[PDB]
Design a protein around this ligand. Sequence first.
Ligand code: SAH
Ligand code: SAH
Ligand code: CL
Ligand code: CL
Ligand code: CL
Ligand code: CL
Lengths: 223, 223
Amino acid sequence: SMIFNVLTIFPQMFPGPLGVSNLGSALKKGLWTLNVFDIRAFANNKHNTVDDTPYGGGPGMLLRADVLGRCIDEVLSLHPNTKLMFTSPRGVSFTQDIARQTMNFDNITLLCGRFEGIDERVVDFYKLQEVSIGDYVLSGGELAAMVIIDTCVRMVPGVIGNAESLKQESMEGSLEYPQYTRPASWKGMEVPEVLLTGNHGEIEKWRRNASLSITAARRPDLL
Amino acid sequence: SMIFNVLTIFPQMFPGPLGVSNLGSALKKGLWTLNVFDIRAFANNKHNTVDDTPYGGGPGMLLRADVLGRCIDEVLSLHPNTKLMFTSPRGVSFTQDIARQTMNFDNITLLCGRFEGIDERVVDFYKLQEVSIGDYVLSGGELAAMVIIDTCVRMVPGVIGNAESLKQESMEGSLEYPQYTRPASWKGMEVPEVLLTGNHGEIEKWRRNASLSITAARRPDLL
Ligand SMILES: Nc1ncnc2c1ncn2[C@@H]1O[C@H](CSCC[C@H](N)C(=O)O)[C@@H](O)[C@H]1O
Ligand SMILES: Nc1ncnc2c1ncn2[C@@H]1O[C@H](CSCC[C@H](N)C(=O)O)[C@@H](O)[C@H]1O
Ligand SMILES: [Cl-]
Ligand SMILES: [Cl-]
Ligand SMILES: [Cl-]
Ligand SMILES: [Cl-]
């Protein structure tokens, strides 16, 4: 019920990080599905060439519209209502919220850029939704796609523990409070005593106030 | 001259995306170095256990300070001036700028969180610099570390073509203009004529104004 199609010239990168731990076992269980399309296999030319120099001059290469179009058209023949997305620094900033909106579609397609990007006609023709994972420049869209997929699949019911998932949701808009586990003492540093009292009321008070204080100090924008 | 130490419970994920294309060949050439430390190998216990339930209650698990400390101390014995960083949603927002500051150190260590995070004592004792790659929740720090490394290594001289690199720098603070390559016509859509005239002056004017218009429409914050 959660299908992601990844379009990439590096299919052997995938599943990669998406293949371990909860994501990976949820993938084996079939709680989500990952289809990785190799863009190169859709190159009709005798060259097998996916990229070419840009019209107008300037350095680098650009993914071609004909190759991309064949690949995307294949994806559309298989999944005609897929939500078409393009990893791009030029796109809207990915957030937990965009992640949730993205999941209201149950079939999502992520095009991974390489080189200097893709021919603009592909973006306009297919109305690709451009998405940036942040204000930094990656070498390719593959990491961005993995980031988007991990974020989304983490919220598919059954992928992570229910309690963890509910706690994560309820903490949204706040920074995580300090957390501790064994050993009791480490390099002479001890765990705050309240957390060792079993006093649920006081522990929860302490956590709320720590989160509140940390949030105001570092992410006041989260109000 | 650019050394990254990645601390992770999933060493087999790496190099992964960092191992392909320019990053990968620069890694083989030795323009940067990647040391992936397996946190599990530093678990002294008979259990081989890196994580444990948090003091004070609440769901999930947390990476232990004793295990992390042994691993990080090993890293410090080898690289005593390494810049210690921790992937965390609670951290400062990674940007091209933080990436450049990060590169003024030539030895960087990235701790990858898993589960609910790590024992806070580790953050305070080692003064870890917390870094978020965006306002979304990943399953682990590994993708964040890859994102940080890719961003940084992309600016190491010799990793990508000089011309591309200079163009990227000069376009900072602006959104990328529309780009085109062959074929001339695709699904009845043609390339803007100015880009086919060879007129460098007019092409550059057109690009500047497209970038300016797109930036104002979507990222006015980039002034
Ligand atoms: N922050 C980011 N978010 C999402 N995708 C990104 C990204 N940074 C790079 N990419 C991906 O990596 C590819 C190559 S980078 C493109 C560089 C180009 N000079 C430009 O400024 O746009 C992009 O096409 C895109 O798919
Ligand atoms: N946006 C982000 N940037 C950097 N690291 C992130 C991240 N999202 C998750 N992580 C990493 O993934 C690990 C597990 S997620 C931790 C979840 C916890 N409830 C919390 O809110 O902090 C984190 O310890 C961190 O290393
Ligand atoms: Cl591949
Ligand atoms: Cl569909
Ligand atoms: Cl592993
Ligand atoms: Cl050092």
